[model samples]
Target: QIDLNVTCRYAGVFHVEKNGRYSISRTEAADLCQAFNSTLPTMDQMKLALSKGFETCRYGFIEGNVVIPRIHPNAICAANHTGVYILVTSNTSHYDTYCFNASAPPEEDCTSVTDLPNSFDGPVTITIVNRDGTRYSKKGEYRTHQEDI
Candidate 1:
């Protein structure tokens, strides 16, 4: 498995509503999402929201002004907070991670789908960059895979 870590320096927002009424958490996500009135974030938005969890980025990373994403970090489940979390950074979509399912019916992991991005070569560990602004090698460095056509 190959991992790539990305750190960007830009701008973004992750809106979500946690319906405190029904499932306060989930509802809150729906509410926040609703506040945006079905509007999505831009690529720059993704960059702004780097610190927020993964799913929080529902359709982050805008390309020239378009939102492209396979998955949002915000959707990754909050860390047990009433409200949601948001992060902004030019460092978004600049990291990678090796993920493992803590629980599974049959234990379905995405390990076999080895191919990463054409920009990245696989079957090896890599760090895209370091905190010191140095080139990093890939280390299952799961990060934002925001791609719009």
Candidate 2:
């Protein structure tokens, strides 16, 4: 699962795309966010996420503004800028989207997932299959005893 590990007023900001990046128009962006049960984030909300190490190279729609967050200097991304970069683009121009979901859960402890033992009883290799048909395998553990069932 994807987690920003940060929140603005208990809401989580996320980057969204359609078939690919830069394929969503301003109007489409708003509609797509609604489909995800979220809305376009405001400038303040985006800034709050950026403050907590949230950064993206892709320009996204945020409250009528197209912005990209850059933590480290990069010549291609934002002209080596190290902050939220705004682009003066037309409304018809296509870009990505930054959506805020109030129902998104807060960040949780990741030690259980990240610190799994490579070899152990009851441990299994879990494979995550993405929508694109790509798969990723990793060691995982069950939190409860199976005998209880």
Candidate 3:
């Protein structure tokens, strides 16, 4: 069974494949989602997933359009765009598939502690050691900071 919690994290958006990439046509994509207990995401739903860092390097079918989400610009994947990149393509064309599990529970803010499993624990400590022997402790929110330089 699919994990609802993981789906919720992505705003219920998820990807599926038949055998390999670009192997599913628009009509097959719809039927495939149904088999997985989901449906093709709408434009709004796709945007929601994009907002949560959902990006793929493959084209897929949305409700009424073909799209690929790109969080970071690159040479490939939506031509270096950084949003829900829509494409005008034939419905019979084959590509990846994005499905939305509408039955997923409402989105919830992530708490480092709440997500931990129940065990004999008080607090969790994480330490990051740089290649130069410099160590950093987990005190603030984890992010890509340039302080290591």
lDDT of 3 at 148: 13
Number of backbone collisions per candidate: 67, 0, 0
Residues 1-149 of candidate 3: C-alpha lDDT, one tens digit per residue: 11111122367776654445676667766654664466889999988888877877778788888889889998877778889988875546777778787755445222221221211222324333222334333322211223311
Poorest 10 consecutive residues of model 3 by lDDT? 111-120
Residue ranges of candidate 1 with Cα displaced over 4 Å: 1-8, 12-122, 129-133, 141-149
Residues 44-140 of candidate 2 have per-residue lDDT tens digits of 8777767766677788889878999778888898889887788975656778778776655443111211221222334455443333344445554
Candidate lDDT (C-alpha), each: 0.28, 0.59, 0.59
Residue 76 CA error for candidate 1 (Å)? 38
Q: Report the alpha-carbon TM-score of model 2 versus the true structure.
A: 0.62
For model 1, what is the alpha-carbon lDDT of residue 87? 29
What lDDT would candidate 3 get against the real structure?
Answer: 0.59
Model 1, TM vs. native: 0.19
- TM-scores across all candidates? 0.19, 0.62, 0.62
Clashing residue pairs in candidate 2, if any?
none
